[PDB]
PDB file of C-alpha atoms and ligand atoms in Angstrom:
ATOM      1  CA  UNK A  79     121.572  50.445  72.535  1.00  0.00           C
ATOM      2  CA  UNK A  80     122.386  53.949  71.644  1.00  0.00           C
ATOM      3  CA  UNK A  81     120.509  55.492  73.455  1.00  0.00           C
ATOM      4  CA  UNK A  82     121.381  57.160  76.541  1.00  0.00           C
ATOM      5  CA  UNK A  83     118.618  58.978  77.775  1.00  0.00           C
ATOM      6  CA  UNK A  84     120.726  62.372  77.669  1.00  0.00           C
ATOM      7  CA  UNK A  85     116.950  63.500  76.533  1.00  0.00           C
ATOM      8  CA  UNK A  86     114.627  64.546  77.074  1.00  0.00           C
ATOM      9  CA  UNK A  87     115.869  67.271  79.994  1.00  0.00           C
ATOM     10  CA  UNK A  88     114.825  67.999  83.717  1.00  0.00           C
ATOM     11  CA  UNK A  89     112.826  71.634  83.992  1.00  0.00           C
ATOM     12  CA  UNK A  90     111.268  74.234  86.021  1.00  0.00           C
ATOM     13  CA  UNK A  91     107.876  73.852  86.911  1.00  0.00           C
ATOM     14  CA  UNK A  92     104.807  75.954  86.436  1.00  0.00           C
ATOM     15  CA  UNK A  93     105.174  79.271  88.657  1.00  0.00           C
ATOM     16  CA  UNK A  94     102.032  79.667  91.227  1.00  0.00           C
ATOM     17  CA  UNK A  95      98.764  81.694  89.880  1.00  0.00           C
ATOM     18  CA  UNK A  96      99.133  85.814  90.048  1.00  0.00           C
ATOM     19  CA  UNK A  97      95.973  86.083  88.877  1.00  0.00           C
ATOM     20  CA  UNK A  98      92.627  83.903  88.730  1.00  0.00           C
ATOM     21  CA  UNK A  99      89.275  86.122  87.291  1.00  0.00           C
ATOM     22  CA  UNK A 100      86.249  83.366  89.372  1.00  0.00           C
ATOM     23  CA  UNK A 101      88.225  83.111  93.189  1.00  0.00           C
ATOM     24  CA  UNK A 102      87.314  86.017  95.277  1.00  0.00           C
ATOM     25  CA  UNK A 103      88.787  89.182  96.361  1.00  0.00           C
ATOM     26  CA  UNK A 104      88.941  92.178  98.705  1.00  0.00           C
ATOM     27  CA  UNK A 105      91.092  95.117  99.478  1.00  0.00           C
ATOM     28  CA  UNK A 106      91.145  94.679 103.464  1.00  0.00           C
ATOM     29  CA  UNK A 107      93.163  97.257 105.681  1.00  0.00           C
ATOM     30  CA  UNK A 108      95.296  94.326 106.623  1.00  0.00           C
ATOM     31  CA  UNK A 109      96.101  93.494 103.300  1.00  0.00           C
ATOM     32  CA  UNK A 110      97.144  97.247 102.264  1.00  0.00           C
ATOM     33  CA  UNK A 111      99.309  96.828 105.216  1.00  0.00           C
ATOM     34  CA  UNK A 112     101.117  93.640 104.180  1.00  0.00           C
ATOM     35  CA  UNK A 113     101.825  94.731 100.639  1.00  0.00           C
ATOM     36  CA  UNK A 114     102.553  98.698 102.142  1.00  0.00           C
ATOM     37  CA  UNK A 115     104.644  97.425 104.827  1.00  0.00           C
ATOM     38  CA  UNK A 116     105.600  94.273 105.459  1.00  0.00           C
ATOM     39  CA  UNK A 117     106.610  92.926 101.675  1.00  0.00           C
ATOM     40  CA  UNK A 118     108.212  96.808 100.954  1.00  0.00           C
ATOM     41  CA  UNK A 119     110.425  95.737 104.044  1.00  0.00           C
ATOM     42  CA  UNK A 120     111.543  92.223 103.106  1.00  0.00           C
ATOM     43  CA  UNK A 121     111.843  93.410  99.451  1.00  0.00           C
ATOM     44  CA  UNK A 122     114.150  95.680 100.731  1.00  0.00           C
ATOM     45  CA  UNK A 123     116.044  93.666 102.807  1.00  0.00           C
ATOM     46  CA  UNK A 124     119.897  92.098 101.447  1.00  0.00           C
ATOM     47  CA  UNK A 125     118.351  88.299 102.426  1.00  0.00           C
ATOM     48  CA  UNK A 126     115.372  88.670  99.774  1.00  0.00           C
ATOM     49  CA  UNK A 127     116.890  87.408  97.134  1.00  0.00           C
ATOM     50  CA  UNK A 128     116.598  84.136  96.927  1.00  0.00           C
ATOM     51  CA  UNK A 129     112.907  84.816  97.990  1.00  0.00           C
ATOM     52  CA  UNK A 130     111.961  87.219  95.513  1.00  0.00           C
ATOM     53  CA  UNK A 131     111.048  84.718  92.063  1.00  0.00           C
ATOM     54  CA  UNK A 132     110.179  81.775  92.144  1.00  0.00           C
ATOM     55  CA  UNK A 133     113.135  79.227  91.869  1.00  0.00           C
ATOM     56  CA  UNK A 134     114.856  78.203  89.615  1.00  0.00           C
ATOM     57  CA  UNK A 135     115.966  74.611  90.642  1.00  0.00           C
ATOM     58  CA  UNK A 136     118.061  74.031  86.761  1.00  0.00           C
ATOM     59  CA  UNK A 137     119.513  77.560  87.176  1.00  0.00           C
ATOM     60  CA  UNK A 138     121.033  77.124  91.037  1.00  0.00           C
ATOM     61  CA  UNK A 139     121.426  72.901  90.233  1.00  0.00           C
ATOM     62  CA  UNK A 140     118.954  71.797  92.668  1.00  0.00           C
ATOM     63  CA  UNK A 141     117.610  68.751  91.478  1.00  0.00           C
ATOM     64  CA  UNK A 142     115.825  67.964  93.865  1.00  0.00           C
ATOM     65  CA  UNK A 143     114.090  70.911  95.438  1.00  0.00           C
ATOM     66  CA  UNK A 144     110.202  70.104  93.245  1.00  0.00           C
ATOM     67  CA  UNK A 145     111.089  66.764  94.044  1.00  0.00           C
ATOM     68  CA  UNK A 146     111.306  67.603  98.334  1.00  0.00           C
ATOM     69  CA  UNK A 147     108.925  70.798  97.514  1.00  0.00           C
ATOM     70  CA  UNK A 148     105.835  70.706  96.629  1.00  0.00           C
ATOM     71  CA  UNK A 149     104.510  73.620  97.302  1.00  0.00           C
ATOM     72  CA  UNK A 150     106.725  76.149  96.247  1.00  0.00           C
ATOM     73  CA  UNK A 151     105.841  79.882  97.238  1.00  0.00           C
ATOM     74  CA  UNK A 152     108.298  83.285  96.581  1.00  0.00           C
ATOM     75  CA  UNK A 153     108.364  86.600  97.119  1.00  0.00           C
ATOM     76  CA  UNK A 154     108.002  87.453  93.916  1.00  0.00           C
ATOM     77  CA  UNK A 155     104.425  85.359  93.362  1.00  0.00           C
ATOM     78  CA  UNK A 156     103.426  87.191  96.797  1.00  0.00           C
ATOM     79  CA  UNK A 157     104.147  90.786  95.829  1.00  0.00           C
ATOM     80  CA  UNK A 158     102.163  90.365  92.404  1.00  0.00           C
ATOM     81  CA  UNK A 159      99.824  88.438  93.892  1.00  0.00           C
ATOM     82  CA  UNK A 160      98.701  91.915  96.612  1.00  0.00           C
ATOM     83  CA  UNK A 161      99.405  93.536  93.601  1.00  0.00           C
ATOM     84  CA  UNK A 162      96.631  92.055  92.150  1.00  0.00           C
ATOM     85  CA  UNK A 163      94.253  92.330  94.527  1.00  0.00           C
ATOM     86  CA  UNK A 164      94.513  88.420  94.553  1.00  0.00           C
ATOM     87  CA  UNK A 165      93.127  87.794  98.123  1.00  0.00           C
ATOM     88  CA  UNK A 166      90.566  87.991 100.385  1.00  0.00           C
ATOM     89  CA  UNK A 167      91.780  88.185 103.488  1.00  0.00           C
ATOM     90  CA  UNK A 168      95.279  89.157 105.475  1.00  0.00           C
ATOM     91  CA  UNK A 169      95.269  84.846 106.501  1.00  0.00           C
ATOM     92  CA  UNK A 170      95.510  83.835 102.197  1.00  0.00           C
ATOM     93  CA  UNK A 171      98.726  85.953 102.016  1.00  0.00           C
ATOM     94  CA  UNK A 172     100.253  85.170 105.450  1.00  0.00           C
ATOM     95  CA  UNK A 173     100.100  81.249 104.768  1.00  0.00           C
ATOM     96  CA  UNK A 174     101.981  82.112 101.670  1.00  0.00           C
ATOM     97  CA  UNK A 175     104.563  83.506 103.226  1.00  0.00           C
ATOM     98  CA  UNK A 176     105.041  80.721 105.595  1.00  0.00           C
ATOM     99  CA  UNK A 177     104.921  78.594 103.097  1.00  0.00           C
ATOM    100  CA  UNK A 178     107.912  79.972 102.235  1.00  0.00           C
ATOM    101  CA  UNK A 179     110.229  79.752 104.941  1.00  0.00           C
ATOM    102  CA  UNK A 180     108.291  76.152 106.035  1.00  0.00           C
ATOM    103  CA  UNK A 181     109.968  75.278 102.203  1.00  0.00           C
ATOM    104  CA  UNK A 182     113.340  76.547 102.991  1.00  0.00           C
ATOM    105  CA  UNK A 183     113.432  74.832 106.397  1.00  0.00           C
ATOM    106  CA  UNK A 184     112.359  71.829 105.144  1.00  0.00           C
ATOM    107  CA  UNK A 185     114.975  72.167 101.712  1.00  0.00           C
ATOM    108  CA  UNK A 186     118.130  72.959 103.750  1.00  0.00           C
ATOM    109  CA  UNK A 187     119.830  72.067 106.974  1.00  0.00           C
ATOM    110  CA  UNK A 188     120.201  74.089 110.432  1.00  0.00           C
ATOM    111  CA  UNK A 189     122.937  76.729 110.134  1.00  0.00           C
ATOM    112  CA  UNK A 190     123.115  76.931 105.523  1.00  0.00           C
ATOM    113  CA  UNK A 191     123.237  80.470 104.799  1.00  0.00           C
ATOM    114  CA  UNK A 192     120.106  80.124 103.116  1.00  0.00           C
ATOM    115  CA  UNK A 193     118.659  79.529 106.749  1.00  0.00           C
ATOM    116  CA  UNK A 194     120.248  82.466 108.445  1.00  0.00           C
ATOM    117  CA  UNK A 195     118.794  84.744 106.077  1.00  0.00           C
ATOM    118  CA  UNK A 196     115.478  82.828 106.197  1.00  0.00           C
ATOM    119  CA  UNK A 197     115.203  82.844 110.118  1.00  0.00           C
ATOM    120  CA  UNK A 198     116.165  87.055 109.989  1.00  0.00           C
ATOM    121  CA  UNK A 199     113.432  87.574 107.167  1.00  0.00           C
ATOM    122  CA  UNK A 200     111.088  85.348 109.517  1.00  0.00           C
ATOM    123  CA  UNK A 201     112.346  87.946 112.927  1.00  0.00           C
ATOM    124  CA  UNK A 202     111.360  90.426 110.865  1.00  0.00           C
ATOM    125  CA  UNK A 203     108.328  89.329 109.148  1.00  0.00           C
ATOM    126  CA  UNK A 204     106.759  88.233 113.121  1.00  0.00           C
ATOM    127  CA  UNK A 205     107.801  91.981 113.891  1.00  0.00           C
ATOM    128  CA  UNK A 206     105.920  93.425 111.569  1.00  0.00           C
ATOM    129  CA  UNK A 207     102.895  91.052 111.735  1.00  0.00           C
ATOM    130  CA  UNK A 208     102.528  91.696 115.638  1.00  0.00           C
ATOM    131  CA  UNK A 209     101.524  95.460 114.268  1.00  0.00           C
ATOM    132  CA  UNK A 210      99.131  94.760 111.901  1.00  0.00           C
ATOM    133  CA  UNK A 211      95.855  97.018 111.940  1.00  0.00           C
ATOM    134  CA  UNK A 212      93.372  94.931 114.306  1.00  0.00           C
TER     135      UNK A 212
HETATM  136  C1  EFL B 502     125.514  77.764  96.518  1.00  0.00           C
HETATM  137  O1  EFL B 502     124.769  78.034  96.472  1.00  0.00           O
HETATM  138  C2  EFL B 502     124.796  79.002  97.484  1.00  0.00           C
HETATM  139  C3  EFL B 502     124.483  79.297  98.438  1.00  0.00           C
HETATM  140  C4  EFL B 502     124.215  80.353  99.195  1.00  0.00           C
HETATM  141  C5  EFL B 502     123.389  80.899  99.171  1.00  0.00           C
HETATM  142 BR1  EFL B 502     122.372  82.120 100.241  1.00  0.00          BR
HETATM  143  C6  EFL B 502     122.890  80.978  97.921  1.00  0.00           C
HETATM  144  C7  EFL B 502     123.541  79.448  96.792  1.00  0.00           C
HETATM  145  S1  EFL B 502     122.737  80.179  95.393  1.00  0.00           S
HETATM  146  O2  EFL B 502     121.450  80.925  94.936  1.00  0.00           O
HETATM  147  O3  EFL B 502     122.997  80.071  93.597  1.00  0.00           O
HETATM  148  N1  EFL B 502     121.822  78.192  95.602  1.00  0.00           N
HETATM  149  C8  EFL B 502     120.696  77.882  96.148  1.00  0.00           C
HETATM  150  C9  EFL B 502     120.490  76.483  97.208  1.00  0.00           C
HETATM  151  C10 EFL B 502     119.825  76.409  97.664  1.00  0.00           C
HETATM  152  C11 EFL B 502     119.230  76.693  98.487  1.00  0.00           C
HETATM  153  C12 EFL B 502     118.758  78.468  97.237  1.00  0.00           C
HETATM  154  C13 EFL B 502     119.879  78.417  96.802  1.00  0.00           C
HETATM  155  O4  EFL B 502     117.735  79.023  98.070  1.00  0.00           O
HETATM  156  C14 EFL B 502     116.876  78.881  97.713  1.00  0.00           C
HETATM  157  C15 EFL B 502     115.655  79.525  98.418  1.00  0.00           C
HETATM  158  C16 EFL B 502     115.627  78.006  96.811  1.00  0.00           C
HETATM  159  C17 EFL B 502     116.224  77.176  98.877  1.00  0.00           C
HETATM  160  O5  EFL B 502     115.491  77.039  99.890  1.00  0.00           O
HETATM  161  N2  EFL B 502     117.288  76.513  98.842  1.00  0.00           N
END
């Protein structure tokens, strides 16, 4: 009768790894471009801020976020992965960006502010990707 299910509480999941000693890794000119050009251009953009860290669903009062998004990804994670030389090739890093944008389009509705932000960042992303060293 007197248990009202006020605990236990929700939480954020553990964030994506940014280190893994047994993962194969390389430094490539494409991955260096991804850090110096692609990530740094997106990072400084005035629409970057919702994407600069793992989604804090507790702070943002988004209790459904990690019910819907099971492969979370953010630019904070990507930045740390690039700084730690985590990737084997450019494809792995690009796929992380694609995951981040796709999550946003899954979770939100066309025309939401967050979606307008993601769309503009995707546009910049694809512009810089078309100049990837070959
Ligand atoms: C009402 O909260 C808003 C409204 C517009 C904008 Br832009 C940002 C916010 S919020 O940062 O306070 N909350 C928020 C609300 C929803 C989203 C979100 C943030 O960003 C992630 C990437 C989690 C997302 O996909 N959707």
